Design a protein around this ligand. Structure first.
Ligand code: KGU
Length: 114
């Protein structure tokens, strides 16, 4: 965390865009609609989605890379937890984990250069 804030935020914005690009159906773009799943919060302690991540970023809630990555990992893990393995949603979370992990490793390399 020994670096300047502004270049770090620029990197997080770019990284978040790269992660969202992997979600081609935009199914992780907004909060899971709780009005449609009244049991969702019985299973999921902390819902997450890319719009919430963007709000958190601009509110200065991500001041280290690990906190940003942790919220991305919640998007994936919540979806794996709630949805059955035979669903497209579950498989899309697996694919996002794979593609997004690669985006995150490269972004972390860039953060280390700061
Ligand atoms: C099962 C709970 N659920 C998850 O657990 C989850 O991880 N995601 C993230 C992959 C979910 C994502 C959505 N979408 C919200 C609308 C955009 C498409 C994805 C919904 N939508 C609905 O429950 C209602 N939605 C059914 C499809 N119809 C075309 C429109 C009305 C539930 C999700």
């Amino acid at each position: 965390m020994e670096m300047q804030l502004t270049p770090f935020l620029i990197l997080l914005r770019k990284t978040l865009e790269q992660l969202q690009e992997k979600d081609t159906g935009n199914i992780f773009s907004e909060p899971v609609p709780l009005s449609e799943v009244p049991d969702y919060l019985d299973h999921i302690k902390k819902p997450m989605d890319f719009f919430t991540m963007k709000q958190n970023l601009e509110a200065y809630r991500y001041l280290n890379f690990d906190d940003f990555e942790e919220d991305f990992n919640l998007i994936v893990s919540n979806c794996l937890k709630y949805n059955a393995k035979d669903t497209i949603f579950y498989r899309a979370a697996v694919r996002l984990r794979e593609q997004g992990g690669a985006v995150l490793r490269q972004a972390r390399r860039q953060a280390e250069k700061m």
